[PDB]
Amino acid sequence: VNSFSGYLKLTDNVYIKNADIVEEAKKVKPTVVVNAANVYLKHGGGVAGALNKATNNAMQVESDDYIATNGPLKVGGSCVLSGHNLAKHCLHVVGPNVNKGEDIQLLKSAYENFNQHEVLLAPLLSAGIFGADPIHSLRVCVDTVRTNVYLAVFDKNLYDKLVSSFL
């Protein structure tokens, strides 16, 4: 039994809700919140900009030190950093950005990072400003993630389309 509330159950392990991931993170304090990161951990907009804003820029400060030490992530890769005031940990996951020409096949690799964590609060990878079709992203999620994932979908109109079209 966990503290996530009001989710619709899509499969054995995938749940979905119309929610602001920032607000859901602050209420739940999940062990892991997933950030829709880029390889430079520059959290300027979309989910990443919102999560970082909610940390009063502490996420960005930590991320800049991470990059200075380790260099950029790979597209499809991830790193675990602090969750600050939002979660115990933040799993920064880089889905392919269609608006940069990155290969969509890397979306499966990106979701594989979730399998290293038993329970996660997450957005749909590569959705929003990353330019992929969120229906495709949901399908890859369901077909790749085996651990328990609670998906937050900010847009109510999109949430309803994802549910209604789910196979």
Ligand SMILES: Nc1ncn(Cc2cc(-c3ccco3)on2)c2ncnc1-2
């Ligand atoms: N605070 C947040 N900001 C951004 N996203 C990503 C996102 C946005 C959309 C979309 C579709 C039409 C308009 O926006 O689809 N995915 C978030 N997901 C959960 N919380 C989020």
